């Protein structure tokens, strides 16, 4: 279709290809919604191939793509108002991923990223995360936002809020964390779990629709790995690092106490301890302003300094009156 | 332990004026300035632009350079000490006219427009701001001694005088006092223009110094001495 | 001794007046000025704001007349905005009046050298690094950079090494003219500084630091 | 709480003052008590607001700009609370759509081979189709 | 420990008729700053609004500011009295002709 309607072939093909760029994006999202567990290899060959085509189109027709991308965000927001998590689907996770590919995420303001980043942060907070399928949906979202801020490394408060509840949710309370608001106490991991077997930390998108202990452990590991990266990149630089990590430090401590064999929290805890040791938590001083100079004014003068008409009429009457009077005398 | 000030917003320091005699300040008096106006329109006589008219007037054109006074004002007003509101400049014209230069003024950088400003000042006796909210340049009553601070040290720039460290001189000097420096903007002449007022004479460097460099060199020393930065 | 670009061993205070707006225009070739030639530059299309050789003139007066220059421990370079590099002999005594300076620049730019009867002012081939000393510290004057004491900066610097300062003679512009050559940029005072004042202040640190007096 | 002047460094400060300032930095400990229930005994006045410092790096631009105010002089007499109180996630999105200034969309020069990781360059390591 | 002034705190700056008026100034001469509002007009408006003239602009309450705005915007409705609210070139040419004649005489 792109070949048959290139811009040079006939007039108006730019507009048609521009709309096709928007149509192509909806197709990429549309396919992800459809079940593909039967032919995952075939779906993998088509989905990435279509994305590559979309990237080439986006280079020339970003404007048409930008309009469609914003429209999807508004449509998805409207569906969230009514159906909440039921509106969300696999394609919605895919859609956010595509935006990262085709747009510059590390910008302070952007047409598509900023609505998308705001909308994702709403899911990380508003959504209940009371089921394994819902938590798995959150784990993917945390990864997306982390890649959005891969260079900017901005601070996302919801990421902190998401980590606290999910880590606590798998330990349900221990009665030492009453400040963290849980939404499901029945997801508590059993004690007999080993945590020593090599379990894949990758969450397949198709599994979310299907969604026991092994799946619960795998989701927890993926969330915990994302936590480790966030501590290393974003929170480490922030001035309030000790405050952000203090609640998480208590939660990780509970994991080590309950599951001695489990190694990931200890590695994070050792890592967190290393950062707090080096960082110098000194009283911030932000009000040291540069002194303001005395005011300056430009002088007022004439470029060619010289040492209405009624006045000129009056002026000349004086000269003539004096110059008449001498004649009379 | 001390409580912080109620308002920390940075505020411009007060604009020094002749009326206030208490504050410690740096006065720089640009003596022997060659500023004179004559009708051709009145133009500030220049050593290069006008030679015949000065010959007809009979004054030697060697001492007919308003450029030197222009350069000294540029470096004095632009020095950070002026930005801190601790320097007020006076000009004693060779003819005997005393001019008070407000620290707030922003003289034109090009020489041509500076000449246009002087002819305005000498005939109108004052220069007002564009927005008209204070007089920037005003002529005042001689002698200069009345206008200077009540407690003030007076010096003048002499090549023959002993060489000193300007920063050290200001440091050893008292605090409530103020320092007045008589700079000779004249191209060449005997350093006695300010002998009547000044109490002693000092040298700043072994090598000869221009009027512009000498004043700037002295200002930077005061800036270090008072930590103006 | 009169320092020269050929000699690299001696410690010296180099100053580079970057973004110097020296240009010759013929209707006869005459140095462009913001005030005298406003229509002519408009025809050329260049903004009259950045058409001020007087800034470059004033900086030369204070630089050449500073005591450090009289002690033979300073050499000046001028990088025109057009891309022309000029070496200023320390022994030169440029004309004090601006008009006589403008007539000198048109002579220099067209004849490429000014000789007395060693060239006082000679145009040289860029880049400046070849001319600069082999061991030399490079800095630019940046208002946004941290404020330092020039006396403290020179004294901590090595002795065999030399210091090169890039002063922006431009009226207004971004301070990246010498970013590619320079290694680190410093602020000289909290308040904004004119080019003439800043070079004068940095010099003053030099005499006190090296005891030129 | 926004700033302690004692910890500011001055270029003119003597080397001994530098040494004394260094020791003060090493010995500092935050005295604020989070569990104390008496607001007068929490020692908050001796502590400082590091939490507000982080917020200038907030992802949203406008929220970051508001946090930057504490780094600016306190010229404004007050801020009208009613203009900030009842904002919602929906309001931010709607306000974002109805933006006075419209910008051009930009594109990323970096290229990723596969959007999701397998079970060359991967945009989302740890997520698979 | 909890004390709240019902009248409210002193207002350093106030906004009336899209004009900023300083609290420290008296009400009449603070309202003079508004364009079209003079000392006599401001005094009459304050008298109609029943505001004590010794008050600073900051001391004013909200209802009184509403009343002042109503006085100013609807003066007639509140019985504010109405009284309260080429040839020369030819002459120059003639003078020039007179001078030319007079020069002709001499």
């Amino acid at each position: 279709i792109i070949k048959a309607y290139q811009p040079k072939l006939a007039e108006g093909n730019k507009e048609k290809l521009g709309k096709f760029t928007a149509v192509l994006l909806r197709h990429i999202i549309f396919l992800s919604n459809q079940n593909y567990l039967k032919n995952v290899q075939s779906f993998k060959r088509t989905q990435n191939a279509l994305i590559s085509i979309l990237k080439s189109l986006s280079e020339k027709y970003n404007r048409e793509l930008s309009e469609e991308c914003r429209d999807y965000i508004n449509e998805m927001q409207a569906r969230y108002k009514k159906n909440h998590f039921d509106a969300l689907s696999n394609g919605d996770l895919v859609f956010f991923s595509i935006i990262g590919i085709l747009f510059s995420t590390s910008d302070q303001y952007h047409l598509v990223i900023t609505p998308a980043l705001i909308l994702m942060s709403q899911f990380l907070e508003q959504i209940k995360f009371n089921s394994l399928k819902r938590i798995a949906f959150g784990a993917v979202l945390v990864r997306i936002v982390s890649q959005y801020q891969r260079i900017s490394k901005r601070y996302i408060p919801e990421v902190v809020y998401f980590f606290q509840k999910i880590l606590l949710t798998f330990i349900v309370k221990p009665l030492d964390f009453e400040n963290i608001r849980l939404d499901s106490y029945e997801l508590g991991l059993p004690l007999d779990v080993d945590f020593t077997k090599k379990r894949s930390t990758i969450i397949p998108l198709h599994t979310l629709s299907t969604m026991p202990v092994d799946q619960c452990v795998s989701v927890l590991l993926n969330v915990m790995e994302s936590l480790d990266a966030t501590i290393s990149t974003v929170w480490k630089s922030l001035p309030a690092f000790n405050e952000i990590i203090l609640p998480i430090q208590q939660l990780l401590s509970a994991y080590t106490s309950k599951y001695s064999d489990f190694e990931k929290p200890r590695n994070i805890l050792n890592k967190v301890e290393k950062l707090t040791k080096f960082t110098e938590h000194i009283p911030l001083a932000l009000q040291n302003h540069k002194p303001v100079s005395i005011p300056t004014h430009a002088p007022k003068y004439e470029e060619n300094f010289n040492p209405k008409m009624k006045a000129q009429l009056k002026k000349e009457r004086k000269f003539t009156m004096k110059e008449i009077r001498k004649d009379a005398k | 332990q001390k409580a912080l000030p109620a308002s920390l917003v940075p505020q411009a320091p007060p604009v020094l004026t002749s009326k206030d005699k208490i504050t410690k300040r740096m006065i720089v008096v640009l003596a022997m300035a060659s500023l004179e106006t004559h009708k051709i329109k009145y133009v500030l006589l220049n050593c290069d632009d006008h030679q015949g008219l000065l010959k007809k007037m009979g004054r030697d054109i060697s001492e007919a350079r308003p450029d030197i006074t222009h350069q000294c004002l540029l470096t004095l007003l632009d020095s950070p000490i002026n930005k801190a509101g601790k320097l007020q400049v006076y000009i004693q014209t060779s003819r005997g006219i005393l001019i008070e230069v407000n620290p707030t003024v922003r003289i034109p950088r090009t020489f041509k427009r500076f000449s246009g400003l002087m002819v305005q000042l000498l005939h109108k006796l004052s220069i007002r701001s564009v927005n008209s909210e204070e007089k920037l340049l005003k002529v005042i009553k001689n002698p200069i001694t009345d206008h200077l601070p009540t407690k003030c040290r007076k010096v003048t720039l002499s090549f023959d005088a002993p060489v000193i460290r300007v920063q050290d001189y200001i440091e050893k000097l008292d605090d409530d006092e103020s320092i007045c420096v008589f700079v000779g903007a004249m191209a060449r002449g005997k350093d006695n223009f300010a002998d009547e007022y000044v109490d002693e004479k000092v040298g700043l460097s072994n090598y000869p110094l221009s009027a512009s460099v000498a004043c700037s060199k002295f200002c930077h020393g005061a800036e270090d001495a008072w930590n103006i930065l | 001794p009169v320092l020269t670009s050929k000699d690299k061993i001696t410690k010296r205070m180099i100053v580079v007046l970057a973004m110097a707006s020296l240009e010759t225009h013929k209707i006869k070739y005459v140095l462009l000025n913001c005030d005298d030639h406003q229509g002519l530059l408009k025809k050329m299309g260049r903004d009259i704001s950045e058409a001020r050789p007087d800034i470059t003139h004033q900086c030369l007066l204070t630089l050449l007349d500073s005591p450090i220059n009289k002690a033979g421990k300073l050499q000046v370079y001028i990088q025109t905005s057009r891309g022309i590099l000029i070496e200023v002999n320390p022994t030169v005594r440029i004309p004090r009046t601006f008009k006589r300076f403008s007539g000198l620049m048109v002579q220099l730019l067209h004849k490429l050298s000014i000789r007395s009867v060693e060239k006082l002012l000679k145009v040289i081939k860029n880049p400046i690094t070849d001319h600069l000393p082999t061991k030399c510290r490079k800095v630019t004057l940046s208002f946004d950079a941290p404020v330092i004491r020039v006396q403290d900066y020179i004294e901590k610097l090595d002795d065999d090494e030399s210091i090169c300062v890039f002063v922006g003679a431009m009226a207004r512009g971004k301070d990246n003219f010498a970013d590619e050559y320079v290694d680190e940029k410093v602020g000289l005072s909290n308040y904004p500084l004119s080019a003439s004042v800043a070079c004068s202040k940095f010099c003053h640190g030099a005499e006190d630091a090296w005891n030129i007096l | 709480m926004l700033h302690n002047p004692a910890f500011i460094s001055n270029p003119f400060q003597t080397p001994d003052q530098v040494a004394n300032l260094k020791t003060l930095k090493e010995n500092y400990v935050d005295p604020f008590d989070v569990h104390e229930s008496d607001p007068e005994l929490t020692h908050a006045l001796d502590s400082s607001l590091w939490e507000l410092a982080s917020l200038m790096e907030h992802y949203h631009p406008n929220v970051a700009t508001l946090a930057k105010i504490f780094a600016q002089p306190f010229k404004k007499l007050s801020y009208n609370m009613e203009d900030f109180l009842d904002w919602n996630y929906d309001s931010l999105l709607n306000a974002e759509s109805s933006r006075k200034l419209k910008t051009l969309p930009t594109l990323e020069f970096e290229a990723f081979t596969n959007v999701f990781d397998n079970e060359g360059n991967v945009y989302l390591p740890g997520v698979a189709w | 420990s909890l004390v709240v002034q019902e009248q409210g705190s002193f207002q350093h700056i106030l906004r009336l008729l899209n004009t900023n008026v300083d609290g420290n100034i008296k009400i009449v001469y603070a309202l003079t700053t508004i364009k079209g509002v003079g000392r006599r007009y401001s005094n009459l408006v304050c008298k109609k609004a029943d505001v004590d003239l010794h008050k600073r602009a900051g001391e004013l309450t909200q209802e009184e500011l509403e009343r002042i705005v109503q006085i100013m915007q609807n003066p007639t409705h509140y019985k504010i009295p109405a009284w309260f609210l080429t040839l020369a070139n030819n002459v120059e040419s003639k003078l020039r002709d007179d001078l030319e004649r007079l020069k002709k005489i001499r």
Binding site: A298, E303 | - | R52 | - | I13, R15
Partner: peptide, 25 residues
């Protein structure tokens, strides 16, 4: 309640540098 206090707070609500030359004319 917002509308009531919104009304009340309506009343409550209210350089050359470096080498820059003075304007030409």
């Amino acid at each position: 309640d917002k509308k009531a206090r919104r009304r009340t707070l309506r009343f409550y609500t209210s350089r050359f540098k470096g080498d820059d030359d003075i304007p030409y004319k």
